[PDB]
From Swiss-Prot, chain B:
It comes from Homo sapiens. This is Histone-lysine N-methyltransferase EHMT2. The chain holds residues 921 to 1187 of 1210 of the full protein. Histone methyltransferase that specifically mono- and dimethylates 'Lys-9' of histone H3 (H3K9me1 and H3K9me2, respectively) in euchromatin. H3K9me represents a specific tag for epigenetic transcriptional repression by recruiting HP1 proteins to methylated histones. Also mediates monomethylation of 'Lys-56' of histone H3 (H3K56me1) in G1 phase, leading to promote interaction between histone H3 and PCNA and regulating DNA replication. Also weakly methylates 'Lys-27' of histone H3 (H3K27me). The record marks Y147 as: Histone H3K9me binding. Residues 154-173, 234-237 are annotated as: Interaction with histone H3. Zn(2+) 2 binds at C54, C67, C97, C101.
């Protein structure tokens, strides 16, 4: 498959399988931006946007939008700072339409979409996954977790929860089971190389942050991308199946889980 | 020619401003936006399942495309220009392909959602203040730009005193809404009225199909020469209100809103 994204992303995203006869997945709708099925009532009031007054490229410390994360966390190249808290990331507020800066300012990384070459491919033990077709320096924006915005009440009534991302006031979830992007195919890794960060762009409704994946380290060509699904995932799912990341750091293998109960 | 792009890089192309008539600097008492904004909720139907979509897997140039069928037929040609036969007097509502469609994004039913492609220039006119012109020829049927502004209700439009930048959206059912580009708008806010206009508005649906909120796309109604001023017909509601304050200066011999013209009708 030449482009699973049907031209909706900045770059084509191919699918390959060199492991078995399983065909490229088609039981979902590809979308490049979050969708709704019943109103979420996102606050789109342009006068509720906090914005900056910059006349430069927003690389100075006086930029309010940068100040909303204590400081802008991007360097000149669009990458997270070396000092960035990869354990507890702050909320990033990117420049918006209420700002006076141009569209090519330095605070517009995530909203400018995918730039690295990625591949949907068949793994050996985890079904489909995504890997890099190129080296990727630490701090690089990879892709966004795109799906269907739903409420916790609705998340409760859905049988399939294998593609849920939590957004925790009142709680909401991103559900990429029926509608989603390339992110829906990223596997859980006990030794992860991408992290999620909560980000705001066109609106600043704090109930609905958007999820951006950045690299936590240098990633070699062909390396599988993975993040930490967290314990709420594994507390539910482990009585059905156990982790196959194979790391010696694995925290969710049948082996690891059994060693724990002995103690 | 001080400002190289009034859109601050938000459009596919830059839109420069020049003034060769007086000392008035490039206008800045408004905010440039490349898309419609809200100030109080419009509650647009954004239900992705309420989208009518097609099953096309080709470039949607087929007769089978449901999206094209919604306007009876896709009215764009292979180059993205309106058909010669397009009703330029009472234009149909056009439904372009969307995210629920199975076609790729480089489909042939996606002209307006692909944004501006011709070179335009904000410039100082002689008798009408600021205007917009072509820095290139524009063939008939070509998409120029969209009328972008603040989505408000008819009720709210009644309450705002400055009404020089309003476009009416009169849905069949009633429940009328307006685009107000006085405080927020794009290059379209600077386009002047022409009694013999060379652009027409078309109502278009793209990312949503909330019928209360058509998006307004301007196409050329005829060939336009390089340097020609762009204009549409603002309509009678505009002039029925404004002509007791000022009169039309389009200078056409077809003008129907000049002091001359207005005086001739009383008999
Ligand atoms: C990050 O991964 C998961 C997040 C999940 N989040 C919720 N909710 C958020 C809180 O508010 C109730 C919803 N429910 C799940 N599961 C429910 C459990 C109950 N089931 C009937 C419906 C799905 C999840 C499951 C996840 O992985 C398996
Ligand atoms: C296309 O041009 C115009 C459209 C206008 N539309 C409305 N509406 C509110 C009432 O429903 C219909 C849409 N009001 C205007 N103006 C005034 C606003 C001030 N108010 C005291 C009376 C109505 C307009 C003015 C226009 O140009 C001068
Ligand atoms: C969001 S999906 C990722 C795409 C999925 N691998 C596929 O083939 O469609 C998450 C599901 O993939 C499988 N999976 C993901 N990470 C795994 C892991 N670390 N170990 C074992 N299975 C995993 C499980 O079926 C899990 O419910
Ligand atoms: C939406 S604006 C167009 C931009 C405006 N000329 C400017 O410089 O800001 C509408 C206003 O432009 C002027 N105008 C537009 N067309 C005109 C015309 N044909 N004759 C006289 N004045 C016109 C009127 O003042 C009208 O209220
Ligand atoms: Zn700034
Ligand atoms: Zn900025
Ligand atoms: Zn800003
Ligand atoms: Zn593991
Ligand atoms: Zn089609
Ligand atoms: Zn379509
Ligand atoms: Zn199409
Ligand atoms: Zn006239």
């Amino acid at each position: 498959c030449r482009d699973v994204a049907r031209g909706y992303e900045n770059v084509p995203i191919p699918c390959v399988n060199g492991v078995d006869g399983e065909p490229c997945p088609e039981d979902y709708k590809y979308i490049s931006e979050n969708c709704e099925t019943s109103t979420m009532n996102i606050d789109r009031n342009i006068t509720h946007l906090q914005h900056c007054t910059c006349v430069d490229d927003c690389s100075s410390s006086n930029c309010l939008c940068g100040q909303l994360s204590i400081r802008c966390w991007y360097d000149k190249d669009g990458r997270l700072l070396q000092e960035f808290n990869k354990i507890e990331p702050p909320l990033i507020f990117e420049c918006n339409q209420a700002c006076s800066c141009w569209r090519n300012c330095k605070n517009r990384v995530v909203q400018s979409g995918i730039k690295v070459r990625l591949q949907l491919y068949r793994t050996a033990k985890m079904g489909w996954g995504v890997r890099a077709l190129q080296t990727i320096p630490q701090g690089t924006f990879i892709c966004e977790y795109v799906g269907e915005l739903i409420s916790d009440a609705e998340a409760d009534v859905r049988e399939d929860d294998s593609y849920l991302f939590d957004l925790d006031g009142e709680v909401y979830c991103i559900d990429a089971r029926y509608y989603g992007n390339i992110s829906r195919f990223i596997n859980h890794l006990c030794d992860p190389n991408i992290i999620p960060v909560r980000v705001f762009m066109l609106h600043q409704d704090l109930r609905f942050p958007r999820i951006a994946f950045f690299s936590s380290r240098d990633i070699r060509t062909g390396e599988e991308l993975g993040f930490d699904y967290g314990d709420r995932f594994w507390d539910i799912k482990s009585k059905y199946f156990t982790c196959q990341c194979g790391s010696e750091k694995c925290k969710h293998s049948a082996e690891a889980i059994a060693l724990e109960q002995s103690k």
